[PDB]
Design a protein around this ligand. Sequence first.
Ligand SMILES: Nc1nc2c(ncn2[C@@H]2O[C@H](COP(=O)(O)OP(=O)(O)NP(=O)(O)O)[C@@H](O)[C@H]2O)c(=O)[nH]1
Ligand SMILES: [Mg+2]
Lengths: 77, 167
Amino acid sequence: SLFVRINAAHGFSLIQVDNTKVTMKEILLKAVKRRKGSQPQYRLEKQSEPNVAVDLDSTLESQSAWEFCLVRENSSR
Amino acid sequence: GMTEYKLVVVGAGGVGKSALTIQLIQNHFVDEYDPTIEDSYRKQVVIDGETCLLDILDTAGQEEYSAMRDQYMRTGEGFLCVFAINNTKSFEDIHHYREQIKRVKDSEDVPMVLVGNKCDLPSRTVDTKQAQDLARSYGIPFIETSAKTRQRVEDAFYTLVREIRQY
Ligand SMILES: Nc1nc2c(ncn2[C@@H]2O[C@H](COP(=O)(O)OP(=O)(O)NP(=O)(O)O)[C@@H](O)[C@H]2O)c(=O)[nH]1
Ligand SMILES: [Mg+2]
């Protein structure tokens, strides 16, 4: 199965994806619900591009990456 | 500014590995069954008066991800081997987890606890002395837990840290 690695403040989560047309928004929502519970605002960053939020409406395919950092908006990775 | 302990939760699919982990970390019971690939959670706790960092690895019960076991078994410092008291197949499955951990550790003793989870449920198909005797054959404690009611959840994880500290 395909999955992405999400690095967060207190550990990592592997998030299953059906395909690379999934949006980055869907991945973030799954990561936040698992690691934080029911709902602070969060962003995802490409592993190799720190301090820049990925466009959550874009597809996983458009990111050309399989590892992301989950960061609270007022914080850094 | 404190010691970290790397704990690993293993066992068949659906026994409650994730529910146990999230009850410990977040004081919350997960009702949904979202199968795990792999997730880690770090939390500062006080155990026997000593502050430390727990690094808990929540692993896959689904056989599709069985290749991952080699990696995490080598560096894990203590293992919760979890079955569900209403699922004798998950009790059978404990042996394959214990045997793979043993092989990767070259047959050393490893901090480990046999955990019988879902003890809140009325249906019980694993017998108590049966579970105690499996634990005794491995030389490890047996602890009955419920991720739903939090029964003995801290006991199970904290026993690993007590053992890692002594070994
Ligand atoms: N009644 C009860 N249900 C529990 C308990 N622990 C887990 N469950 C339930 O059992 C189901 C599976 O739990 P989960 O923690 O996802 O199991 P898992 O071992 O992590 N599964 P996987 O190996 O696929 O990741 C969920 O519906 C969960 O609510 C418990 O102690 N009591
Ligand atoms: Mg799980």
